[PDB]
Amino acid sequence: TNRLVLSGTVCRAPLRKVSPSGIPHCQFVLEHRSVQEEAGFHRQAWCQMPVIVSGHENQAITHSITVGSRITVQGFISCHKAKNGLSKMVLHAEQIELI
């Protein structure tokens, strides 16, 4: 099992492109903030989660998203070795809601 459902606000301009092999992809960052109850305590959960929406199916849906847009994404997480060398945890969207 690998399923993450996360809501947040797009905090970085959506980078749209198509792979040299014809794969449409949209990348952006999702900023999440919430109050969480853990072991009886109230703590804040926060993260700026990189999100990638690949494939023709979800490309149109993203057109409505820009910096400031609030969305809820469902997909799987996976780690990637960025150019910075460090490891980058990113959410591969399978589903996206615009409100």
Q: Considering the complex, state which of residue 16 and residue 94 has its C-beta at the smaller distance from a second copy.
A: 94
Binding residues for a second copy, per CB under 8 A? 1-7, 9-13, 23, 31-34, 36, 38-41, 43-49, 54-58, 66-70, 72, 76-79, 84, 86-87, 89, 92, 94, 97-99
Residue 16 CB, nearest approach to a second copy (Å): 14
DSSP string, 43-85: EEEEEEEEEEEESSTTHHHHTT--TT-EEEEEEEEEEEE-TTS
